[PDB]
């Protein structure tokens, strides 16, 4: 189950687990997945209810999970219902999710991790590959 309105919240994806940096300062920063957290809580995520969805909190930036130009996921300070709404899915394989584009009708572009440090980015859900699968995992 998803761990709702947990602040020790890593957000994994294989050996790797997201991070995010606060805004120097329309402003963001990219959510890296590493296995190196850049200062205190980088790594450290809050999850909570938004509507028919979630919003996803890095409690070291203070920024949220966003989707920006190009389809690529940042960390932004303000938040935004139509930028920052997720669908999380359980994919069917031990704890792992998909966090999708909230979309009347399904079929949201999902967390993309391309295959040292990565970036993220929307992409059709491809059930197999595990660039896409997610795990959270509390402290």
């Known amino acids: 189950k998803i761990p709702l309105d947990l602040p020790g919240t890593r957000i994994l994806n294989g050996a790797n687990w997201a991070n995010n940096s606060a805004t120097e300062n329309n402003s963001g920063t990219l959510i890296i997945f590493d296995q190196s957290t850049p200062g205190q809580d980088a790594d450290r995520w809050l999850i909570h209810n938004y509507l028919d969805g979630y919003k996803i909190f890095n409690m070291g930036s203070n920024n949220w ?17 139509q930028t920052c709404k997720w669908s999380i899915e359980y994919s069917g394989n031990g704890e792992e999710f998909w966090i999708r584009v909230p979309r009347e009708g399904g079929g949201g572009a999902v967390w993309t991790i391309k295959p040292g440090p990565t970036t993220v980015f929307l992409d059709l859900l491809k059930e197999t590959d595990p660039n896409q699968r997610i795990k959270f995992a509390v402290d």
């Open 65 to 81: 999970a966003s989707v920006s130009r190009g389809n690529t996921v940042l960390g932004v300070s303000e938040f935004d219902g």
